[PDB]
Structure 1
Amino acid sequence: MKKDIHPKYEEITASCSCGNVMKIRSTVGHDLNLDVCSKCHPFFTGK
């Protein structure tokens, strides 16, 4: 990895409204507000 050419790599704490708190390698900013997640998602019930 080369410095000064790639964006920031700051640690953030994301959490959906369901209650799933996880640390995601991203560049959103100070915080990451979410509404859905891999779990608690009504995909296996709609089908």
Structure 2
Amino acid sequence: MKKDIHPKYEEITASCSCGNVMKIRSTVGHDLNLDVCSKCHPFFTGKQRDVATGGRVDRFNKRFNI
């Protein structure tokens, strides 16, 4: 790489709401506090729940009884 032209690329620490700690090299400089990581993202359970089609007959039978 060239010497001066590229920005500073320094290892910092990024902690998250799930308590993950990951040291990465970045151009931020300061330490980083995250919101979601790949550990705590609801991609493997929540997005599965998040389809939620629901039944029309079941709503019908739910609303009363004959």
- Unaligned 5+ residue runs, structure 1? none
Structure 1 length-normalised TM: 0.83
Displacement, 1:30? 1.4
* Equivalence for 1:6: 6
* Equivalence for 1:22: 22
Bigger Cα Rg:
2
Higher helix residue share:
2
Displacement, 1:34? 0.5
- State how far apart, in whole Å, the 2-side matches of 1:36 and 1:46 are: 13
Structure 2 length-normalised TM: 0.63
Runs of 4 or more above 4 Å deviation: none
State the identity as a percent.
100
Displacement, 1:39? 0.6
